[PDB]
C-alpha cells in the first residue's frame, strides 16, 4: 500500500458507485481521520490493510498503524488554511481566521467553512504547513451556518 505522507480520500463501494465518506492524513506511517468517518473499521490501501490503533468517540478521532502523531496547535492569533478535499473535486486550500469554541474545559479554535459531509477529516494547517487539527466535527449556529472545531489529538 501507499504510505507516502499527504492527504487522502476515504472511499467505499458499499453504496451506489464509489462514494467518498471522508478524508485523512498520512504522517510518519500513521493514518489519521475522524472517528465518525470510519466508525473504527479497518481500511484498505491498494492490496494492503490498515488496522485501527487508537480511537476515541468523544474526541471524534482515530489513528491507524500506530499512535496519533499530529501535535501542532493553532497559535490563537493567525489565519490558517483548510486543505479541503471535497467529494469528486480537487484538493483546494481555503484561508480563514478561526473563531473560538468556549467550553467548560477550555477554548478550542473553530473554522467557519461549510463543505459536504464527505469532506470530514480534511486537515487544517498553520503557515508552516503543520497539521493543527482535522475539520468536520462542529455545530450549526443561529443563521443555519456550519462551524467546525479545529480537532487535534494528543501525541503520547
Ligand X SMILES: CS(=O)(=O)c1ccc(N2CCNCC2)cc1
Footprint on this chain of another protein (rule: CB under 8 A): 2, 4-14, 21, 23-25, 27, 31, 35-36, 38, 41-45, 50, 57-60, 79, 81, 83, 85, 90-105, 110-113, 123, 125-129, 131, 137-139, 141, 147, 149
* Spatial separation of the C-alpha atoms in residues 27 and 23, rounded to whole Å: 13
Q: Which of 80-103 are b and which e, b meaning 16 or more Cβ less than 10 Å from the residue's Cβ? A: bbbbbbbbeeeeeeeeeebeebee
The catalytic residue positions are: 36, 60, 120
Give whichever of 117 and 141 is closer to ligand X, judged by the CB atom: 117
Shortest reach from residue 98's CB to ligand X, in Å: 19
DSSP states of 1-70 as a string? ----SEEEEEEESSSSSSEEEEEEEEETTEEEE-HHHHTT--EEETTEEE-EEEEETTTTEEEESSS---
Based on CB atoms, which residue is closest to ligand X, 39 or 130?
39
Using the minimum distance from each CB to ligand X, give the nearer residue, 3 or 52: 52
Q: Enumerate residues 41-100 that contact ligand X by CB under 6 A.
A: 60
Tell me the three cell numbers of residue 24: 485523512
Footprint of ligand X on this chain (CB under 6 A)? 36, 60, 117, 120, 136-137
Amino acid at each position: 500500500g501507499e504510505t507516502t505522507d499527504g492527504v487522502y480520500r476515504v472511499m467505499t463501494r458499499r453504496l451506489l458507485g464509489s462514494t467518498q465518506v471522508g478524508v485523512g492524513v498520512m504522517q510518519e506511517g500513521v493514518f489519521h481521520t475522524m472517528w465518525h468517518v470510519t466508525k473504527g473499521a479497518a481500511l484498505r490501501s491498494g492490496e494492503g490493510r490498515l488496522d485501527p490503533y487508537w480511537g476515541d468517540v468523544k474526541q471524534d478521532l482515530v489513528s491507524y498503524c500506530g499512535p496519533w502523531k499530529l501535535d501542532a496547535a493553532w497559535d490563537g492569533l493567525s489565519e490558517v488554511q483548510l486543505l479541503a478535499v471535497p467529494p469528486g473535486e480537487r484538493a483546494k486550500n481555503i484561508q480563514t481566521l478561526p473563531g473560538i469554541f468556549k467550553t467548560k474545559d477550555g477554548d478550542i479554535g473553530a473554522v467557519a467553512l461549510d463543505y459536504p459531509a464527505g469532506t470530514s477529516g480534511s486537515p487544517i494547517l498553520d503557515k508552516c504547513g503543520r497539521v493543527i487539527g482535522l475539520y468536520g466535527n462542529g455545530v450549526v449556529i443561529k443563521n443555519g451556518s456550519y462551524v467546525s472545531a479545529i480537532t487535534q489529538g494528543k501525541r503520547e
